[PDB]
Structure 1
Amino acid sequence: IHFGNLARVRHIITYSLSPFEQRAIPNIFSDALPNVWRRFSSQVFKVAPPFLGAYLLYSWGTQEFERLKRKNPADYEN
Structure 2
Amino acid sequence: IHFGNLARVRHIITYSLSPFEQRAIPNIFSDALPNVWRRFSSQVFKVAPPFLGAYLLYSWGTQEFERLKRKNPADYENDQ
TM-score over 0.5 for the alignment? Answer: yes
Runs of 4 or more, structure 1, over 3 Å off, are: none
> What do residues 28-64 of structure 1 show as CA deviations (whole Å, max 9, x unaligned)?
0000000000000000000000000000000000000
- Superposed CA offset, 1:7-28 (max 9, x none): 0000000000000000000000
Residue ranges of structure 2 left out of the alignment (5+ in a row): none
Identity %: 100
Q: Scaled by the length of structure 2, what TM-score is found?
A: 0.97
Find the aligned partners of 2:54 and 2:13 in 1 and give their Cα distance. 50
Distance 2:30 2:11 in 1: 32
Q: TM-score, normalised by structure 1?
A: 0.99
Unaligned runs of 5+ residues in structure 1 are: none
Measure, in 1, the Cα distance between the counterparts of 2:12 and 2:77: 87
Instruction: Write 1 or 2 for the structure with the bigger share of strand.
Output: 2
RMSD value, Cα: 0.3
Structure with the higher fraction of residues in helix conformation: 1
Q: Which residue of 1 aligns with 2:69?
A: 69
Residue-pair matches, total: 78
